[PDB]
Each structure stands twice: as C-alpha cells, then as structure tokens.
Write a protein that binds this ligand. Structure first.
Ligand SMILES: CNC(=O)c1ccc(-c2cnn3ccc(C(=O)N(C)c4ccc(Cl)c(C(=O)OC)c4)cc23)cc1
Ligand SMILES: Nc1nc2c(ncn2[C@@H]2O[C@H](COP(=O)(O)OP(=O)(O)O)[C@@H](O)[C@H]2O)c(=O)[nH]1
Lengths: 473, 171
C-alpha cells in the first residue's frame, strides 16, 4: 500500500516498528524492505532486539529468515562479540534447522580463544559437583581459576560488560561458590583492560606476578574496599583502563527466561524515562551460553534482604536508620526516596509479568536504598506482597511516602499503557517455537495485554491501583 | 497514434513486474501486492522521433495460463525480462524465461534484461556486472531499475521503445 511505504519513510518508523511488521506482515516485499532498513538503524538500537531476530530466523518461515540473514552476517563481520552472542543465541533456541548451519558458519569464519575461555568456566562449575560442602567447592574453584591466568591476556572478553575490553588477569582468591548444590552457581572477579573498539585493538601486554597473602585475603568488605586490595596486589592495577568486573556463572540453570525479563526491564526503564516518571529498576545483563547454562551480571554493593535481616539481626526499618541515619538526616530521606521509587517500579514489573516466587531471597538491597528483584523464573503463565516490614520503611500507611508510592504506581501504569506495544512484542516474539514454562495455554499473551487495562479510564486505573496495594498485604 | 506497439512482461513471481508496469503508466507503488492473475493490462503513449506511439503492455503471469500467455507472445514487438536483484534464484531462471519467450515470440522481438529492486542496496545478491555481461553475451539490454524509488523506470521503457522504433526503420 502507498500508506505503508509512507509510514516506513516517516520518522515515526523506529526499530521497534520494523520488528513488529517483520513479525506480522505476510508480504515478502515488506519483509525484505525492512530487512534492508536494519542497516540504516543504529547499531545499538538493533542489538537490543537480537534475541527476537535470531528467534525469528530460526522459527519463522524462510521468507522472514532470509530477510534477516544479510544484516546478521554484516554485523557478525563488524563485531566479534556480535558473532559470539549470535552463535550462542542460535544454538540456545534451536532445541537443528537453518540456525545450526548459520551458527557453524559464524564459528568457522579468532573466536577459538573466547570459546575456550567460556567452555572452561562451565567445566569448572560442573567439576565442583562431586564436592559436597560449599567450602570444598570453593577450594577447587580458586585453584582452577588460578590456571586461567596461564592463558591471559588473550582475545577474550565478558559480554555482560557494556564496554569493549580484554581479560588480562583473574584474581582466583576472591571467587566464591554460592551454596552446596550440585549445580551450584559461583561468583568470579575479573581484571580487564578497556579499549576503544575491541576488533581493532591488539591483545594487551603481559605482566607477571610473584604470594604471602597481602591481597589474597577474601573477606566481607565493601566493593570500594574489595577493589583496592585487588588493584594493589595486581600487576595491571597501575593502568588507566584497569576495571574490575563481577560475573555469576550458572553452569546448570537455564537463563533464557532471565534474558526475556532483562529486556522487559530495560524497555520499561526506557518507557518511564520517556514519560518522565521517576520510577527505578535495575536490569542486569544475561549471557545465554546455551539452553541450560549462562552468566549473570553481578550487581556490586547489593545483598539479599534475607541476608541483611540475618546478618544485622534487625528489621528493615531498623537497618536503614543504622546504615543511613536518623529520621531527620538527609542520608535517610534519600535512601527512603530510593526505596519508595524502586518499590513502585518493581511492583508494576511484578504485576505486569506475574512474577511469582517472591521472597526476600530474591529481593536485594543496594547501598543507596533501592531494591532489586532477581530470579525471574516463575513469570507469566508466592506472588508479590508489600509486607508489613516494607510499609514501615515508607513511614506507614497514612504517611506521605506511601501515598507517593501509590501515585508512582499510577503514573507508571499510565506510562506503560502509552507504550504497551513495545513491551508485549518482546514477550510475544519469544513465544514463537519456545518450550519455556512462561508460555503455556496460548493465553500467555492474551492475559499479558489484558493486564495493561487499556480500556479503563484513568479514574478506573486509580481504583485498580488501590485494589492491587490491598491485595499485596 | 502513428504506431501501436505490443510489449509483454516476463519474470518470476514477486520480482516487481506489476509495480514496474504500475510505476510507468501511473506513479503508484504498493508494498502490499496481489499476484497477477492471468494477465494485467496498462497503456501509455510516447513520442519517438516526433511520432506518437501507443504501447499495449501486458504483465503475463506462462505455463499456468499457457493458452492465454502464448496468445500475448504472438505479435509482441518487445519484452522486458525482469529479475529480482535481491533474489539470486530469479536470476538463475532468466535463461529459462528466455527459452519460453523464444519458443512463442518472434525473433525480431527486442528483450531487455531488467534488474528490479535496486533500492535494496544491502540485500543485493546479483552483481551488476554479471548481469551487464550476461546481457552482452545474450544480446539483451541490461539496466537495473527501482519501481519503489521510481529510478530508471521511465528511462528503461524509453530505451526499449526507442530501440523498437529504431529497429523498424528498416522498412
Ligand atoms: C535465575 N537467576 C538467578 O538465580 C539469579 C539472578 C540474579 C542474581 C544476582 C545478580 N546480581 N546479584 C547480586 C547479589 C546477589 C545476592 O546478594 N545473593 C545473596 C545471591 C542470591 C542468589 C544466588 Cl544464586 C547468588 C549467586 O549465585 O551468587 C554467587 C547470590 C544476587 C545477584 C543471582 C541469581
Ligand atoms: N524494494 C523494491 N520492492 C519492490 C519493487 N518492485 C516491487 N516491489 C515489491 O515486491 C513485491 C512484488 O510484487 P509484484 O510486483 O506484484 O510481483 P510480480 O508482479 O509478480 O513481479 C511487492 O510487494 C512490491 O511492493 C522495487 O523496485 N523495489
């Protein structure tokens, strides 16, 4: 139609709209036209939709796939990181089919050092399965990671870091195994060197070391103090681009449903910023290694509320007063504002995504006062509760900050309605050809759209927010 | 009109036959497209050497409508074999389209190998030089057009109609 070409020509045509028509249009000429406009969007804008594109190349008809293939091949040549995350996502979502063949080609045509490093970190986690205690696992984790330094520096990077870099040293001592489970996750710290563009800068120079435990001491300390001991005892800590990263390696849990939640989190974060609503959420990057392994971006200066309640032996309100300050100091009033804004943010994230399995082991607390929800495993298809302890930090029911917590949820829901399509398509595309527990009964997307309550007036949204808060109690 | 030319359009389904035939007669391009059933007819007049020529252009869909598409090849003074630039299969079957045209058209018919969809710069699968070399080796006219961008669309018909007029000069 003349109008469609006009809309595509019209600036209103953004990268989100190109995805929707590519997923919905049955006209190949329209699919092929959009497959050529991908080259004209920004590099960063299209990458956010890479799980949607590669899932469309694998599970849609050959017309949709062969319209996406030229942009993927072009991007795989520009960025080796793009090549890596492509092959990882290709083999993750196809149980066979065309994607295996594409993945083999990407692997065949400098990726071997990176693939060897990732294959090692997953081999370490699997080997720790025979050791029953969490301290016996940590004893082998640290000595095995001390062997990766024999292969460093190298053409090896961590995709969960927003910048291009090379891994130069790993401090084995600071790594910790989380629990005594067979598929137990573990945390690792990695020293990297940032560059302007990874595919142009050569491997950094190697600097040896010589122990005596001056920096090996692994103790519970602030992140600012954990870096100081590491940078001091490191041979690369004197460099300007020296940066310390933190990654959680889960070698036996599937993180694809955690990647879907990362996108929905980052889109809502984009929607509220656009609508100038001061909500707050924390999206942590997910590196899907395979259909049952991956990595988690470790947020620093953040600890489970279950651990804050155990370590401090206090209540939540008592901890903020001790950690931040009195009712009349600026330090507490700031941490309370960050608590309220982050709560109202994650309240909507929970309601819209139906995030079940909500206890204080899956809720964090950063140093500024925000909260962070993790383990998006029971979503769509235990529910979120604003417990008696949470209402206290906001000054009680009749207080001002609780009414502000109420209005923040309303403003953020009005905002999410103005951009419902950008969020639903993230979930709707991934339902294609997936066997994840979130998609079941074919009502997953019908009920997801129904929860936005597009038909309701703003007056009826107010009463809807009142009811939701009462249930959360 | 001084002359009444009869031109046909051949090519694999989905290469821009209907939109090239559209964009020439009237400046209309549609992405949402219906496949041509049987044949499509559009007309336009041109002036070559000051003689007003009328062109009956038919978008022949040929084995599917063999009884009808063959009746439009008979007496056809010209033909435009168009292929998709962003689809290498439609370029491999060009020889097959030339074979069916030669079987049912006159030897004097001038055939122009057109490479549609030149706006799809990045998805290009057929090189420009391989088509221009394939034209000289087979005695055709190579020229890549864009019915969407409306570039070379009016200049491709006027380089085969002027050729259809210059070859009728031997009278
Ligand atoms: C399916 N997905 C997950 O299970 C997932 C998602 C995000 C996280 C996560 C990201 N940053 N971050 C910062 C702090 C903490 C944190 O305080 N605790 C106490 C914590 C809780 C649970 C685990 Cl399993 C671990 C762990 O492996 O530590 C080595 C640590 C957790 C996280 C962990 C697991
Ligand atoms: N990008 C581009 N697309 C085109 C061009 N010509 C046609 N199309 C599209 O490709 C499809 C071809 O449809 P149509 O012309 O009816 O196919 P045909 O008549 O059998 O060759 C339609 O969706 C058109 O919108 C062109 O020059 N450039």
């Amino acid at each position: 139609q003349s109008w469609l070409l006009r809309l595509f020509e019209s600036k209103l045509f953004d990268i989100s709209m190109a995805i929707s028509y590519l997923y919905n249009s049955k006209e190949p000429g329209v699919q092929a036209y959009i497959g050529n406009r991908l080259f004209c969007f920004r590099n960063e804008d299209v990458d956010f939709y890479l799980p949607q594109l590669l899932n469309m190349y694998i599970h849609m008809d050959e017309d949709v796939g062969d319209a996406i293939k030229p942009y993927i091949v072009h991007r795989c040549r520009q960025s080796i990181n793009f090549s890596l995350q492509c092959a990882l996502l290709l083999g993750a979502y196809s149980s066979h089919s065309r994607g295996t063949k594409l993945r083999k080609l990407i692997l065949s045509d400098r990726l071997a050092p990176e693939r060897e490093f990732i294959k090692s970190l997953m081999a370490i986690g699997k080997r720790l399965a025979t050791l029953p205690t969490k301290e016996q696992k940590t004893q082998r984790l640290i000595s095995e990671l001390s062997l990766l330094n024999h292969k460093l520096p190298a053409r090896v990077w961590l995709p969960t870091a927003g910048f291009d870099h090379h891994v130069v040293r790993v401090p084995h001592t600071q790594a910790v195994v989380y629990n005594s489970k067979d598929k137990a996750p573990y945390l690792i710290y990695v020293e990297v060197l940032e560059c302007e563009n990874f595919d142009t800068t050569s491997v950094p120079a190697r600097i040896p070391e010589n122990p005596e435990d001056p920096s090996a001491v692994a103790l519970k300390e602030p992140w600012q103090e954990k870096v100081r001991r590491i940078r001091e005892g490191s041979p690369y800590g004197h460099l300007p681009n020296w940066r310390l990263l933190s990654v959680i390696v889960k070698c036996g849990d599937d993180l694809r449903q955690e990647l879907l939640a990362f996108q929905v989190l980052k889109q809502l974060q984009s929607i509220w910023e656009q609508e100038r609503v001061p909500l707050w959420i924390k999206p942590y990057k997910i590196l899907v290694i395979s259909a049952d392994s991956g990595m988690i971006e470790y947020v620093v200066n953040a600890v489970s509320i279950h651990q804050v309640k155990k370590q401090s032996q206090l209540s939540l309100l008592d901890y903020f007063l001790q950690e931040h300050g009195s009712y009349t100091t600026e330090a507490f009033l700031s941490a309370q504002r960050n608590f309220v804004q982050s709560c109202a943010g994650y309240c909507l994230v929970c309601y819209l995504l139906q995030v079940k399995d909500r206890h204080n082991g899956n809720i964090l607390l950063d140093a500024e006062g925000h909260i962070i929800h993790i383990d998006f495993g029971f979503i769509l298809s235990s529910a979120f509760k604003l417990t008696t302890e949470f209402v206290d930090v906001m000054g009680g029911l009749d207080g001002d900050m609780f009414n502000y917590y109420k209005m923040l949820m309303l403003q953020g829901l009005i905002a999410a309605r103005k951009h419902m399509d950008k969020v639903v398509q993230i979930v709707e595309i991934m339902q294609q050809g997936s066997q994840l527990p979130c998609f079941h009964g074919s009502s997953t997307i019908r009920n997801l759209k129904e929860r936005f309550h597009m038909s309701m007036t703003e007056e009826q949204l107010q009463l809807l927010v009142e009811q939701m808060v009462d249930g959360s109690m | 009109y001084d002359y009444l030319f009869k031109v046909v359009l051949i090519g694999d389904s989905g290469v821009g036959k209907s939109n090239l035939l559209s964009r020439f007669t009237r400046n209309e391009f549609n992405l949402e497209s219906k496949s041509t059933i049987g044949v499509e007819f559009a007309t336009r007049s041109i002036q070559v050497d000051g003689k007003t020529i009328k062109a009956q252009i038919w978008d022949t869909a040929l084995e599917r409508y063999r009884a009808i598409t063959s009746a439009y090849y008979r007496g056809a003074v010209g033909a435009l074999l168009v292929y998709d630039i962003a689809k290498h299969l439609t370029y491999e079957n060009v020889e097959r389209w030339l074979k069916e045209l030669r079987d049912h058209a006159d030897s004097n018919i001038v055939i122009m190998l057109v490479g549609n969809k030149s706006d799809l710069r990045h998805l290009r699968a057929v090189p420009t030089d391989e088509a221009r070399a394939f034209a000289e080796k087979n005695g055709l006219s190579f020229i890549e057009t864009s019915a969407l961008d409306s570039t070379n669309v009016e200049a491709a018909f006027q380089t085969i109609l002027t050729e259809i007029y210059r070859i009728v000069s031997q009278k």
